[PDB]
Design an enzyme around this catalytic site. Structure first.
Site, PDB file in Angstrom:
ATOM      1  N   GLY A 161       5.276   5.150   4.465  1.00 57.25           N
ATOM      2  CA  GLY A 161       5.215   5.572   5.853  1.00 57.25           C
ATOM      3  C   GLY A 161       6.578   6.031   6.347  1.00 57.25           C
ATOM      4  N   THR A 162       6.622   6.391   7.634  1.00 55.21           N
ATOM      5  CA  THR A 162       7.877   6.877   8.205  1.00 55.21           C
ATOM      6  C   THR A 162       8.957   5.800   8.179  1.00 55.21           C
ATOM      7  OG1 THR A 162       6.796   8.527   9.597  1.00 55.21           O
ATOM      8  CG2 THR A 162       8.989   7.752  10.279  1.00 55.21           C
ATOM      9  N   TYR A 163       8.576   4.538   8.366  1.00 50.42           N
ATOM     10  CA  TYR A 163       9.456   3.408   8.093  1.00 50.42           C
ATOM     11  C   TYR A 163       8.585   2.185   7.844  1.00 50.42           C
ATOM     12  CZ  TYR A 163       8.713   3.053  13.165  1.00 50.42           C
ATOM     13  OH  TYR A 163       8.160   3.022  14.424  1.00 50.42           O
ATOM     14  N   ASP A 206       3.230  14.477  13.610  1.00 49.60           N
ATOM     15  CA  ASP A 206       3.329  14.230  12.176  1.00 49.60           C
ATOM     16  C   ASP A 206       1.959  14.390  11.535  1.00 49.60           C
ATOM     17  OD1 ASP A 206       4.560  13.688   9.750  1.00 49.60           O
ATOM     18  OD2 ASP A 206       4.564  11.518   9.993  1.00 49.60           O
ATOM     19  N   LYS A 220       1.808  -3.278   8.726  1.00 49.49           N
ATOM     20  CA  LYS A 220       3.034  -2.509   8.574  1.00 49.49           C
ATOM     21  C   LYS A 220       4.182  -3.434   8.941  1.00 49.49           C
ATOM     22  CE  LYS A 220       5.619   1.213  10.814  1.00 49.49           C
ATOM     23  NZ  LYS A 220       5.554   2.549  11.508  1.00 49.49           N
ATOM     24  N   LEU A 238       0.798  -1.218   0.000  1.00 50.30           N
ATOM     25  CA  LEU A 238       0.000   0.000   0.000  1.00 50.30           C
ATOM     26  C   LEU A 238       0.834   1.273   0.000  1.00 50.30           C
ATOM     27  CD1 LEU A 238      -2.818  -0.901   2.573  1.00 50.30           C
ATOM     28  CD2 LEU A 238      -2.884  -0.951   0.058  1.00 50.30           C
ATOM     29  N   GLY A 239       2.106   1.192   0.364  1.00 52.23           N
ATOM     30  CA  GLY A 239       2.950   2.370   0.379  1.00 52.23           C
ATOM     31  C   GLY A 239       4.016   2.264   1.440  1.00 52.23           C
TER      32      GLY A 239
HETATM   33  C1  LIG Z   1      -5.996   1.773   1.902  1.00 53.74           C
HETATM   34  N1  LIG Z   1      -5.255   1.862   3.179  1.00 53.74           N
HETATM   35  C2  LIG Z   1      -3.927   2.418   3.204  1.00 53.74           C
HETATM   36  O1  LIG Z   1      -3.480   2.784   2.172  1.00 53.74           O
HETATM   37  C3  LIG Z   1      -3.097   2.528   4.512  1.00 53.74           C
HETATM   38  C4  LIG Z   1      -3.440   2.108   5.808  1.00 53.74           C
HETATM   39  C5  LIG Z   1      -4.735   1.421   6.273  1.00 53.74           C
HETATM   40  N2  LIG Z   1      -4.877   1.049   7.680  1.00 53.74           N
HETATM   41  O2  LIG Z   1      -5.611   1.176   5.507  1.00 53.74           O
HETATM   42  N3  LIG Z   1      -2.403   2.414   6.596  1.00 53.74           N
HETATM   43  C6  LIG Z   1      -1.450   2.972   5.858  1.00 53.74           C
HETATM   44  N4  LIG Z   1      -1.880   3.058   4.587  1.00 53.74           N
HETATM   45  C7  LIG Z   1      -0.946   3.679   3.514  1.00 53.74           C
HETATM   46  C8  LIG Z   1       0.372   3.560   3.465  1.00 53.74           C
HETATM   47  C9  LIG Z   1       0.846   4.306   4.406  1.00 53.74           C
HETATM   48  C10 LIG Z   1      -0.429   4.944   4.062  1.00 53.74           C
HETATM   49  C11 LIG Z   1       0.747   3.983   5.861  1.00 53.74           C
HETATM   50  C12 LIG Z   1       1.893   4.331   6.592  1.00 53.74           C
HETATM   51  C13 LIG Z   1       1.930   4.061   7.947  1.00 53.74           C
HETATM   52  C14 LIG Z   1       0.857   3.460   8.552  1.00 53.74           C
HETATM   53  C15 LIG Z   1       0.937   3.175  10.054  1.00 53.74           C
HETATM   54  C16 LIG Z   1       0.979   2.963  11.224  1.00 53.74           C
HETATM   55  C17 LIG Z   1       0.929   2.780  12.746  1.00 53.74           C
HETATM   56  O3  LIG Z   1       1.952   3.538  13.382  1.00 53.74           O
HETATM   57  C18 LIG Z   1       1.071   1.121  13.148  1.00 53.74           C
HETATM   58  C19 LIG Z   1      -0.097   0.672  13.462  1.00 53.74           C
HETATM   59  N5  LIG Z   1      -1.057   1.926  13.645  1.00 53.74           N
HETATM   60  C20 LIG Z   1      -2.417   1.917  14.184  1.00 53.74           C
HETATM   61  C21 LIG Z   1      -0.235   3.208  13.143  1.00 53.74           C
HETATM   62  O4  LIG Z   1      -0.630   4.326  13.122  1.00 53.74           O
HETATM   63  C22 LIG Z   1      -0.275   3.108   7.823  1.00 53.74           C
HETATM   64  C23 LIG Z   1      -0.287   3.377   6.441  1.00 53.74           C
END
Ligand SMILES: CNC(=O)c1c(C(N)=O)nc2n1[C@H]1C[C@H](C1)c1ccc(C#C[C@]3(O)CCN(C)C3=O)cc1-2
Ligand SMILES: Cc1c(N)cncc1-c1cc2cc(Nc3cc4n(n3)CC(=O)N(C)CC4)ncc2c(N)c1F
Ligand code: NA
EC number: 2.7.11.1
Lengths: 290, 291
Positions: A22-24, A133, A42, A19-20
């Protein structure tokens, strides 16, 4: 940590697509093999000579975080030196992804977003946690049009560095008090998230934060100069005085006078009636039509 | 590159290692003698690898070679050989003020006033070069055989510079960042005036042989400085010291950085501007050490 699932996440989840970033780490879309529910994973690789303090702090931040406007945390899998953080799936992606197709958001849409983010921030700050952030890229939207805060990588890094510099502080008997306050408290507090939210409100209104055309280093230098002015909405007559005032108070330069999340939730722009996820379902409909 | 002026040769071609200095306190510093001239130097050895991050060392040498001043330890260059970097500096027979007072006992008010004046001159120069020492203490103030006071150990200073460099190369997109966060990212949350506070503590250290609260847990002491009612430390023996010395402690130990005077300002304070201050006070201290 006994909370960690010591098994292969593919035991429970079919991995579907990346999906992409993120910070890491890499984030994957996946499906529960039993229930058929969708999740995101993740994946963070822990290589032999790696400090895992930041990862451990991230898990610590999420383990006790339970609020509807924060992407839910279901747990973590450790397998083959990879840590898979399993979380709630938000099918529409981030607001930034969205508005790059749909164009700028309406005022009512922004008001709903801001209210929902503020509810998440109040909960987070009530736990003495900071996001640090906040931006359109970190505000996720699910298929129901509901708003979720995500990506605590920066938050975790800050907490790990604070714990590290504290552990390696040595003898502070010659250290000045302001240096000690920075070492223990970091130099700022949770009210930085309120400013970032105000900038995000502009982002959603104008498709980019102020000075996005300017080199990041130059931007840092401008914000520290004596003459720095809080940004404003570019088009005056397009937005209500309530929206302008919201921007004005969230972008208060002094953190001593910047209102808290809980206080901002009583602001008329986000406390007004008629704010519901249907405003975002409308946005997702613009997406559906190219 | 660690430093364009590095000597790519083993320093033991030219020097004989005589003894380690600091007993681990200063790290791997060695008294060394020129194989030919007999001149003494200090060689500080730092181990290196291919995988090792050289940012801090690079910053430390840049500080040393660009900040030449009468009150900064003299720097003669650096050797790189077989994954070992050697920082060559002047050798100070008496060592640091901590080495000295552990033998001689507490310094006199005039000797402390002279040290304070010399350190303030070095700090004024460092701050004028947009540099912060951040580790001023008796153990980091050297006294050479000529009786000259010289600031040393820029390792913390180097670390701080290396952290700033890494934050800015990895700054990302700070367009959503609050002004006070941008200030901390860029300027660290404090300024060179922390060195003025450290010198005030050092003056007490030279008079009492311990900094204030030396017997309190480091983390406890750190917390106390953040509490609103933190009273800056004072000299124990009131009667032993002049009013000017007490007032000097008072002003350097101004807890608000908004009101703490700069190094140049502090040099016009009555204590460090008095005509009786001359190198002979330190030569006298060295004479006492020799006996
Ligand atoms: C259709 N969907 C998504 O494209 C999605 C979701 C999605 N859930 O659907 N998440 C991301 N993307 C994309 C990619 C990037 C955006 C991203 C980058 C970081 C995190 C994170 C994190 C946490 O630190 C760990 C667990 N948690 C609750 C956090 O905040 C989530 C996502
Ligand atoms: C202070 C220091 C820090 N903090 C970190 N890195 C290096 C030094 C540093 C130490 C030096 C020490 C000496 N000479 C002496 C003489 C004595 N000692 N050291 C201690 C000792 O072992 N004894 C037995 C007592 C006498 N000369 C020049 C030095 C120099 N240029 C430095 F940069
Ligand atoms: Na040593």
């Amino acid at each position: 940590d006994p909370d960690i699932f010591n098994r292969d996440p593919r035991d429970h989840y079919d991995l579907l697509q990346r999906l992409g970033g993120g910070t890491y780490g890499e984030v994957f879309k996946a499906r529960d093999k039993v229930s058929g529910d969708l999740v995101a994973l993740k994946m963070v690789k822990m290589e032999p000579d790696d400090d895992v303090s930041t990862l451990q702090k991230e898990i610590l931040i999420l383990k006790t975080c339970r609020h509807a406007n924060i992407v839910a945390y279901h747990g973590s899998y450790l397998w083959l030196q990879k840590l898979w953080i399993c979380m709630e799936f938000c099918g529409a992606g981030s607001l930034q992804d969205i508005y790059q197709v749909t164009g700028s958001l309406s005022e009512l849409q922004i008001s709903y977003v801001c209210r929902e983010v503020l509810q998440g921030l109040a909960y987070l700050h009530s736990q003495k946690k900071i996001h640090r952030d906040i931006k359109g890229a970190n505000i996720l939207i699910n298929d129901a049009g509901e708003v979720r805060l995500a990506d605590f990588g920066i938050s975790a890094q800050i907490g790990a560095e604070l714990a590290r510099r504290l552990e390696f502080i040595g003898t502070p008997y010659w250290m000045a008090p302001e240096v000690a306050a920075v070492a223990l408290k970091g130099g700022y507090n949770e009210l930085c998230d309120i400013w970032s939210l105000g900038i995000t409100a502009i982002e959603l209104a104008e498709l980019q934060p102020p000075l996005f055309d300017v080199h990041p280093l130059r931007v840092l230098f401008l914000m520290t100069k004596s003459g720095y002015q809080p940004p404003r909405l570019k088009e005056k007559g397009k937005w209500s005085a309530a929206f302008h005032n919201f921007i004005k108070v969230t972008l208060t330069k002094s953190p001593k006078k910047r209102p808290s999340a809980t206080k901002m939730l009583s602001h008329q722009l986000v406390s007004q009636p008629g704010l519901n996820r249907g405003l975002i379902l409308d946005l997702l409909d613009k997406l559906k039509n190219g």
